[PDB]
């Protein structure tokens, strides 16, 4: 995703699903290659100690001054018509300048953005339609002209453009913080299990203090862990052992 040869236009932002692997987030938050590295409802350091069912890496390209529009509850052309984040977004946004790659002598026009739409996008909605936008009261019938415009437009990416107008590559990491079995964990190593003692336990990011005992609960093959009346964890399934 980060080392990708080519990126997608913001209107047709690519999505890569990450599952069933170990994520060494250090390589990102220790690297100096990134201008913007903004994590919402999560600290990157702690990601090493966490598991998730799925991760979504949404990749695209924008101009610099619009990078601020990649954030929860922002407005503008990008966040309205191209790529909308939810207000309760939990994840990271990484962005770095790509003037050396995405800009060329004479102007790179391969990268587009949606300029018109009848309504704002929903979070993680993808609109790749090319319908003629009816700006006025007259039906276009797929014919361009007065108040009938093509919804997309190119970015003017030249190496001499202002940093504001220079191309920036963007990657958005969203995590599936659901309670379900987690296939995307951090590098943190595991240890042996101690029973019948007061211990500080961490199971797949689920932290706590207590005494771990062999249970008699009739857990189902799929059930990961249990709760009591108070909405507190009461019993778990060993990630390494059934």
């Amino acid at each position, epitope marked *: 995703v980060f080392n990708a040869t080519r990126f997608a236009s913001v209107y047709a932002w690519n999505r890569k699903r990450i599952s069933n692997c170990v994520a060494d987030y250090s390589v990102l938050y220790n690297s100096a290659s990134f201008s913007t590295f903004k994590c919402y409802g999560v600290s990157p350091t702690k990601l090493n100690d966490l598991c998730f069912t799925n991760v979504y890496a949404d990749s695209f390209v924008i101009r610099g001054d619009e990078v601020r529009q990649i954030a929860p509850g922002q407005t503008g052309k990008i966040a309205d018509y191209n790529y909308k984040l939810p207000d309760d977004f939990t994840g990271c946004v990484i962005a770095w300048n790509s003037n050396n790659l995405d800009s060329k002598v004479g*102007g790179n026009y391969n990268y587009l953005y949606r300029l018109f739409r009848k309504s704002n996008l929903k979070p993680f909605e993808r609109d790749i339609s090319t319908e003629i936008y009816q700006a006025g009261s007259t039906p276009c019938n797929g014919v361009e002209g007065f108040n009938c415009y*093509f919804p997309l437009q190119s970015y003017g990416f030249q190496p001499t453009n202002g940093v504001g107008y220079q191309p920036y590559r963007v990657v958005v990491l969203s995590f599936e913080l659901l309670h379900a079995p987690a296939t995307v964990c951090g590098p943190k190593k595991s240890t042996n299990l101690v029973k019948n003692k007061c211990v500080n336990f961490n199971f797949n990011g689920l932290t706590g203090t207590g005494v771990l005992t062999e249970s008699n609960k009739k857990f189902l093959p799929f059930q990961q862990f249990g709760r009591d009346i108070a909405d507190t964890t009461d019993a778990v399934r060993d990630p390494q052992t059934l």
Partner: nanobody
Amino acid sequence: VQLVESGGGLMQAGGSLRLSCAVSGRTFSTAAMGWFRQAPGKEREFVAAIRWSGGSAYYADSVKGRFTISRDKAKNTVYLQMNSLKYEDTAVYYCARTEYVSYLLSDYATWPYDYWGQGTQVTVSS
């Protein structure tokens, strides 16, 4: 990337000719194709443009009702059907291509294009 023009040549006034322009080489994307013309000693002048997506066309006033621009996406070819030829139509005709997508079709009349064909002579006789 090359633009290879063909067709045209000599035709008597009132007749019809078709110009072709084939795009060869690896293209990332095409936004629009256009035809321009240059009569001897005169400035090169816009004739017609077509958006690759959707196929909406924009015409110079001088050719409206007479010329039709069309596109075959699969063949990566643009055509100019030149009907009701007049002496005024005598010129070298140039194919042009751009990857620049404007929301506004009329921009293709004045946009500086990135790629140009070699030019094809059209001569209209009496």
